[PDB]
Paper text:
Here, we produced γH2A.X using a hybrid chemical approach and assembled nucleosomes with either H2A, H2A.X, γH2A.X or mutants of H2A or H2A.X as the incorporated H2A variant. Nucleosome stability/dynamics investigations and crystallographic structure characterization were carried out in combination with surface plasmon resonance (SPR)- and bio-layer interferometry (BLI)-based techniques to measure the kinetics of PARP1 association with and dissociation from the DSB constructs (represented by the blunt-end DNA termini; Homo sapiens histone and PARP proteins). Additionally, enzymatic assays were performed to shed light on the catalytic parameters of PARylation. This reveals that PARP1 recognition of and activation by DSBs is modulated by histone variant composition and post-translational modification status.
In order to shed light on the basis for the variant-specific differences in PARP1 nucleosome association, we sought to obtain well-diffracting crystals with NCP, which required screening of different DNA constructs. The H2A.X variant primary structure differs mainly from that of H2A with respect to the C-terminal tail, after residue 120. The 142-residue H2A.X has an additional 13 residues at the C-terminus, while most of residues 121–129 are different relative to H2A. The other histone fold substitution entails His (H2A.X) in place of Asn (H2A) at residue 38. This alteration impacts the H2A loop 1 (L1) and H2B C-terminal portion of helix 3 (α3) region, which coincides with the sole motif of interaction between the two dimers. One of the two non-tail residue distinctions, H38 in H2A.X, results in an unusual histidine-pairing motif at the L1–L1′ interface of the H2A.X-H2B dimers.
Author numbering:
A (entry chain C): 13 to 124
B (entry chain G): 13 to 122
C (entry chain D): 26 to 122
D (entry chain H): 28 to 122
E (entry chain A), F (entry chain E): 38 to 135
G (entry chain B): 21 to 102
H (entry chain F): 16 to 102
Write the structure that this text describes.
Amino acid sequence: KAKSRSSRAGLQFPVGRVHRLLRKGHYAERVGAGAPVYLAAVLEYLTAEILELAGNAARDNKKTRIIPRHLQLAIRNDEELNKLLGGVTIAQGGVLPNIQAVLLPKKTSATV
Amino acid sequence: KAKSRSSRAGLQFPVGRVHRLLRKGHYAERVGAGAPVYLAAVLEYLTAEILELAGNAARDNKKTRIIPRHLQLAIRNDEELNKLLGGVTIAQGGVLPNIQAVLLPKKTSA
Amino acid sequence: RKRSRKESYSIYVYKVLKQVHPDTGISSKAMGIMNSFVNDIFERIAGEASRLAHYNKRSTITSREIQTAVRLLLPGELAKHAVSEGTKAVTKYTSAK
Amino acid sequence: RSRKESYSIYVYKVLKQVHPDTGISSKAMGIMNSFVNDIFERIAGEASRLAHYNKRSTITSREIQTAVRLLLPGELAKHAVSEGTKAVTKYTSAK
Amino acid sequence: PHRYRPGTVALREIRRYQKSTELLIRKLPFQRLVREIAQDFKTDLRFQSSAVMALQEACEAYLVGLFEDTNLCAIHAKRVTIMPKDIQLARRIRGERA
Amino acid sequence: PHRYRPGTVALREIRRYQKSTELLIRKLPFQRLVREIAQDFKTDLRFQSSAVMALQEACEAYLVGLFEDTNLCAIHAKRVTIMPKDIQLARRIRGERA
Amino acid sequence: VLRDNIQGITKPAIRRLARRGGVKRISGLIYEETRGVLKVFLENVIRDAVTYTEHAKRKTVTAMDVVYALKRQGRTLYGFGG
Amino acid sequence: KRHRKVLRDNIQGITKPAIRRLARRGGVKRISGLIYEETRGVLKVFLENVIRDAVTYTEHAKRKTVTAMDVVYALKRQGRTLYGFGG
DNA sequence: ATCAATATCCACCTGCAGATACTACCAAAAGTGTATTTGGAAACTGCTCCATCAAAAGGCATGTTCAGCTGATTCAGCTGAACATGCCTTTTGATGGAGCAGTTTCCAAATACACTTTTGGTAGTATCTGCAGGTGGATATTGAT
DNA sequence: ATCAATATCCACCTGCAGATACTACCAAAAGTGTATTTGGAAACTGCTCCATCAAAAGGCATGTTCAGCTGAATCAGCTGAACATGCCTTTTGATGGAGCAGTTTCCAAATACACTTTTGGTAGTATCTGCAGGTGGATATTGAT
Ligand SMILES: [Cl-]
Ligand SMILES: [Cl-]
Ligand SMILES: [Mn+2]
Ligand SMILES: [Mn+2]
Ligand SMILES: [Mn+2]
Ligand SMILES: [Mn+2]
Ligand SMILES: [Mn+2]
Ligand SMILES: [Mn+2]
Ligand SMILES: [Mn+2]
Ligand SMILES: [Mn+2]
Ligand SMILES: [Mn+2]
Ligand SMILES: [Mn+2]
Ligand SMILES: [Mn+2]
Ligand SMILES: [Mn+2]
């Protein structure tokens, strides 16, 4: 009846792994049995939040496969993910389409 | 009998205390006999370097006691110390006298 | 001679992907970014935790460190939600032995 | 009433070698302490990373060096690297 | 009757204050604003004397710095008068927002 | 013989390039600049193709990032034309030489 | 004569900080703009400080709390310990 | 041996046409003639600061090959953290 | 140019806030002697980096042309800087108690051990399938007149 | 407001590259469940040092006046965009060679570990004195005339 800690905690993300990586970086003398459960959840939680916003971007561009450009549109269009990943560069991500107003043509009537 | 590792490496900085802080800083499982000597030395050197320049700034301002204002003038007027501490504030440091040119008055007969 | 085992989070990110978007794939590049993302956030927290434990003369990182570290590192609504999902998975794991 | 260690003894020693007739306010002494702790953590930490990047369980003087190369600018680096290598040699060469 | 021209006292205040290190916000009104903002995060808090003083040193340091980069932004647009748009440009480029 | 007016193709290119994610520096010229600069630090060096590509990704990202800030500085001066002094104001305020 | 606390940070105080930062001439709109910035700073810093306090099971925010805050906000302060 | 052919002026491989493309992605509409040289300079500084650190890791490891991980660890140190090349 | 109104410098004094100097006691450094752990030294892989080269698209270099942007000019009206108070807030100093922090206790929870089980990462294969890029062809967008 | 040049869009169509997928399967993880200590929550106090609070004291809110700044309108020269033309380099796809990362086994140095012996460093105290302003008067700077 070997019963995964992940399964015990109700998680996809691998608690056993997260306990072993906390040990091997040391980070402290001892690691509480709850630490690697709480952390594996927070990690699962954040990857979920991104994948949902990325998938949405993929769907928005008529794609079935999330590429880097998608992940980038997700992270940069979300105010809170943008700040978390403010000092991170996503390879092959590009930038958000954004032309300063003052740069747009003004050859039409419009303003009287 | 009992020699100081400090006195052995010929340092004012405490090679014992540096070793202890490296063990109990979760930096790795093991710490070589040499590392805390090397480090102690690098901290001493850099301390020496700053105090030197500051001392000089306290002498420039007719003063024998170094204050924060002296450490700020020392650091921010040295190109290499200023880069190292570019992300640091010195409480009671102030700033370097510096007034952009264009803000100075016209002046001269012309 | 047998190439050495280079473990990733790929298996788990994929399971989660199918939970949120059952019909959506992910490129090996995008899965790359998603691995480096977990690895990054793992350290940031484990780090803040490591420190925080120290700052209070504690030798043991508990789920109480993990949580404070999450309130420090995550902004507003990501923190609230990440703290829920944590607390919950812990409260469960406790009562699930 | 518990012992609050500092570096203020060894700052003051290093002041008097360098400016034997120069003093230091408490407030300056505090900045110096922040300074030493600050650089201590910066070096120890980069050395911690290096050890891990190379699957080494041990921070040696070699790590402290690479570290000092990466964290210190040009001339500071050279002169720290020397001052280090010297102190280590002096310590080895001491029955 | 005697009168200094626009900017002359200003230049004088620059020189005066660039020479000193004393804090430039009165202590009490800073202490109130700190305690107020904190109350929105935890109630019935107490503050070590040093903790407020730390906050003020950091806080003034920060602003003085931002006034440098602001003034460089004003100057960049051939002005000698700092305006909001200047503080805004500085905080955008600093990565502090937008 | 028809002619798009100055700045219409520019705007066309902004849309084109902000839409894409391909690297804009030719690969080989960039690989030589990498071997040139490195060799000058240490001879006989070899580079994993991924190490060269990692650098190119960071560099383009940095530059695109700088150019956004630069553009802001130009605009701040009531211009539409980026000049060295914009790049310099950007890098001063970023703290790349503050 | 009740007045907001943020308005306790007076035009002459803000003028003095601007002077140390080498500013000659100050638009009237600066003083509010500045207070708004100063507020966001303190929010960002104090939040983190208190978070340390609450971790330590204390009701007294310590210098160290602020300093540790200021260090993870990238504004590292020398002269208050650590 | 063959001894490698001599590497020089490779910064001029960052063509005027590649620097415009980059400025376009940064949403730039009009570019002064003096920009291309300025940008070559800024790029060169950036590349140096990264390659130096990268090679510092390579040497510390006692390798003669710079890895993708050496560049990533270097970019992270410079506060330019890069996703998509390991770590 | 003068002349004065005010700011600024410099030399000297001196009380005390805040150094330096002194002392004793104990935490934590260092000495001693086992008890583990590690990270090259040598000896082989296979990988992947280097170089080479051939073919050809694909982008770069260059010269011409002029649209329109930059920067200079001039100016009017607006907007902050300067300036003097007495009143109001801050500051200064001293009292009581909140709470930090010192300390001992003890047990739930963490580490260490050495088995047992399962998993996830792999190499090997097959096997599908999303979409890159190419083609018409219908549909904006732009710019001149 | 017309129309012509040309860029854009979009929706199908192939043939892969890269994804998904069937194991095979097995070395390393993960985990099961004893036997440790042992970290730190908990409870108690004492003694800092923090909030308060009322006297002492010195900045700042206030309105007026106009200096000179900003921003507006104009214009000219020239810079930088666009585009046509010619063609050099990079890109793409192999190959053969080998340089060198990356693995696996001995262990002789190298740290860790448990104990003991001593002492350097702290924290109370006990004095000493650098300099922060205070004064006087000489001089510089500024601004009106
Ligand atoms: Cl726990
Ligand atoms: Cl060593
Ligand atoms: Mn879903
Ligand atoms: Mn005199
Ligand atoms: Mn030609
Ligand atoms: Mn007028
Ligand atoms: Mn009490
Ligand atoms: Mn499996
Ligand atoms: Mn397509
Ligand atoms: Mn205990
Ligand atoms: Mn002209
Ligand atoms: Mn080798
Ligand atoms: Mn002694
Ligand atoms: Mn004086």
